[PDB]
UniProtKB/Swiss-Prot annotation:
Belongs to the eukaryotic release factor 1 family. Pelota subfamily. The chain holds residues 261 to 371 of 385 of the full protein. Component of the Pelota-HBS1L complex, a complex that recognizes stalled ribosomes and triggers the No-Go Decay (NGD) pathway. In the Pelota-HBS1L complex, PELO recognizes ribosomes stalled at the 3' end of an mRNA and engages stalled ribosomes by destabilizing mRNA in the mRNA channel. Following mRNA extraction from stalled ribosomes by the SKI complex, the Pelota-HBS1L complex promotes recruitment of ABCE1, which drives the disassembly of stalled ribosomes, followed by degradation of damaged mRNAs as part of the NGD pathway. Component of the Pelota-HBS1L complex, also named Dom34-Hbs1 complex, composed of PELO and HBS1L. Interacts with PINK1. Interacts with ABCE1. Interacts with CNOT4. This is Protein pelota homolog. Signal peptide: none annotated. It is found in: Cytoplasm. It comes from the Eukaryota. The gene is PELO.
Amino acid sequence: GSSGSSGTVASRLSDTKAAGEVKALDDFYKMLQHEPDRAFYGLKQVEKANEAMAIDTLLISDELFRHQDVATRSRYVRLVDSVKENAGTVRIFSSLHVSGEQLSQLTGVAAILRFPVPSGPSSG
């Protein structure tokens, strides 16, 4: 087998603007436990998933979307628009909503993948 074995969904209502980001966070985190081959985080990984056109939905904290350092900011905004170029979805997270401190464990920048990108799950 493969699927099954202890999994849930903490579904609850929220503000619809927040709840799109939260759904993407949730759907992402599900995979992050299961198969992080479909759940990329950290700018570099996401930039590789963009080459793969594999990005279903791209997560970023708005504070990174408007980083102070021009080069740092540039990367994120470039990658963001370049996912729209690849017809992926974009999700703008808030520092305020708990989904921001959540994303912080993942450098505040991630994306869900439609297929497991050919770089494997995670490493040690």
